[PDB]
Amino acid sequence: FDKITARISRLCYGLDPKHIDAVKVTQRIISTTIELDNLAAETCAYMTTVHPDYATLAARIAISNLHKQTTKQFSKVVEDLYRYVNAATGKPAPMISDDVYNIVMENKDKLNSAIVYDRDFQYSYFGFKTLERSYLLRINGQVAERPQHLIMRVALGIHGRDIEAALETYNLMSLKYFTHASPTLFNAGTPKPQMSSCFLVAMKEDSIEGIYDTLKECALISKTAGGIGLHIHNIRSTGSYIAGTNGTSNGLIPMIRVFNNTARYVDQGGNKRPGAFALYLEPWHADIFDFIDIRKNHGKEEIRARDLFPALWIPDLFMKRVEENGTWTLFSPTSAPGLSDCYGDEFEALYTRYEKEGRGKTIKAQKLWYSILEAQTETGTPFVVYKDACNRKSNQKNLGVIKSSNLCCEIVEYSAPDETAVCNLASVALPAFIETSEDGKTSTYNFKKLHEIAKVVTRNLNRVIDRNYYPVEEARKSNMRHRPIALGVQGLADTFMLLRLPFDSEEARLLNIQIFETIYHASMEASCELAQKDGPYETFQGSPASQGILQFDMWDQKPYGMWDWDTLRKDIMKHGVRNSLTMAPMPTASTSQILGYNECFEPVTSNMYSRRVLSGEFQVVNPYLLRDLVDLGIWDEGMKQYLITQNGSIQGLPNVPQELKDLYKTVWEISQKTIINMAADRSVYIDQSHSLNLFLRAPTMGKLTSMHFYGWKKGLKTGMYYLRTQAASAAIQFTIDQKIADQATENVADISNLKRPSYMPSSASYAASDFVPAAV
């Protein structure tokens, strides 16, 4: 029997007994001690619709539930995980590394009493559950680790015997200022710590040995988390000589199906595995037409492969030819060699000479276009990365010719048969640097704090290089030579909302520029400090950075100037930098979900959407918007139905102030010419590239075309990650009572009741957080 309503009503503070009503919660449990608490948090989540303070309630339950059924003290949890004898095989299967177990035990007091277990309450219910499902180490399908333990372990995984640097990293991470990529969270501090995310693999040689070494290498990388970009330009097309000849070659497709099959094989079950390769190919390759279609559902199933992602490595020349209405030539790399191995002008000269001497097959440039746009429309792929932009604007340009990007399209690093480029990723939580004035009515953005934290994260990523467990020797060889690194961001969208800036506003335009300028400056500064401690990276001498050319110099752009570039440039030219690259904003698909923020630099895709199961299927509304509507009095069952029929859009309510409407525009409602502008803006502070998705409502070849041509002309590197499309008719949905949903436009809003800080911009010379004291 029950009076658990007591256990539940205990956990509300900053509540409101009319908003919440712990009584109502118990009733909705219409059906051991732990089973009830799960449902208590489940149902209590369901009512996020009822009131936004139910989210907070459901988090508390799940969290202090986790506490009850879990060992409080860090060192003991570390013991258990280290001592784990495999339940069914009798033999020692430890989950902490020997090294980190020793550090923990040697420093148990200092460590144990640094943890603040309250900080477990910093998680969205859904964020918590994401951790719980895949990240918190489990003993016998029982969660062993609290969130705080996962963080300490990760901190020790990165810093080793540097307890000071670990305590710091523990603090910043537990306060959600930043986070490391999924592989780091999984594997830091474990027997073979593979913590890197991306690997760019070169197809070793156009031969069975070549192909099968690459395959083995890919299998090894993929099985230890971490995803692949694989360029395959050098492999002969359909119908090409083979010694032992009668056989003409079967081309790429058969090969691709071998890779596809391995991708599926290695993904064995209980996921941790980005079982996902992207393949990179230049559009002159004679098998391009088939390659491009790899992901389509209809058509011939022999010629298809769905665990793989096609990605275009595009020369300017191709865009030039489709832009006039020119010809385009397809070649087998055996007949037209070295094309993948030069760029810009050197490429146009070589390519063109091959054209003139009648090699390869002439076709209409716009015919390939067309096929490309067609695949993108149905499949979201192939990706577009501009090969000349990458190679002209890379700090690594002295290593040779960069032939690919990675699985998402953010990292751009040299790679060759014997050098597999690797990269470590973390993202900064942008909302974390908002500061509110005392009085609650003016807000500010702390670029100094941000600069600081980015230096911390630069130092972490740099240490992972040394502590990482490389799955293949080509990876280690490369990473020790060039020491690249990838910082990215998350929660851009939440911070525009929090600051009441419309995504496409002038204020947001400028904040975007400022955030990115400061992170680039921070990481370069930290990296110069590390060169002064451990020497430059092996390959620094002769790089563009060594001649004092920073990224924005390659784009012929004067920096915004919030930070002193003249000093840094001089320092770098004299001391060097530890890392060859530092910036590559990634999709933060899983990490942003954990931290409870929007994807990355993307606008919110929808103000209403579903979250995963557990006794039903969950409808949920944008938290900032929800509180705004509740504060405007407007929030109805009815407002909720209206929202469900407009699929989260707010743009139809005459009801609601324009400001609100501008603030809550959706990626579908925002000009793509704006998204690309902002991308082009931050790009000048990006070493590498960023994972730019594009979104279209009623897609037409035409807006799709001008989208590509626009990015390309602004000199972007990643023209397009995925293409995300939405029929105009999807934009509207059924609801169970359409006329209740209509009455919602008749609700009358306050305004004298909705207040929200107002943002004080900073400039290249005026801070702002400097001049406005913050709260506590």
Short structural description:
The chain is an alpha/beta fold and 776 residues long.
Could you give the count of β-strands? 19
Q: Main sheet: which strands, in order across?
A: 9-2-3-4-5-8-17
Largest sheet: 7 strands, mixed
CATH domain topology: Anaerobic Ribonucleotide-triphosphate Reductase Large Chain
CATH architecture annotation: Alpha-Beta Barrel
Helix content: 40-55%
| Discrete helix count | 31
Q: How many domains would you count in the coordinates? A: 1
PDB class: oxidoreductase
Keywords: Eukaryotic, ribonucleotide reductase, dNTP Regulation
Assembly: monomeric
Entry title: Structures of Yeast Ribonucloetide Reductase I
Which helices and strands occur, and which strands form pairs?
Blueprint: H1 5-9, H2 22-27, H3 33-46, H4 53-68, H5 74-83, H6 98-106, H7 108-112, H8 125-134, H9 147-159, H10 163-174, E1 178-180, H11 182-187, E2 198-202, H12 208-223, E3 227-231, H13 252-266, E4 277-281, H14 288-291, E5 308-314, H15 316-323, E6 327-330, H16 344-356, E7 361-364, H17 365-379, E8 383-386, H18 387-392, E9 421-423, E10 425-429, E11 434-436, E12 442-445, H19 447-467, H20 473-482, E13 486-490, H21 492-498, H22 506-534, H23 551-554, H24 565-575, H25 589-595, E14 608-611, E15 618-621, H26 623-631, H27 639-645, H28 658-663, H29 672-683, E16 694-696, H30 703-713, E17 718-720, E18 723-725, H31 740-743, E19 758-759
Parallel strand pairs: 2-3, 3-4, 4-5, 5-8, 10-13, 12-19, 16-18
Antiparallel strand pairs: 1-10, 2-9, 6-7, 8-17, 11-12, 14-15
Helix pairs in contact: 3-4, 4-8, 5-6, 8-25, 9-10, 12-13, 19-22, 22-24, 22-29
Site (Important for electron transfer): 721-722
EC number: 1.17.4.1
Subcellular location: Cytoplasm
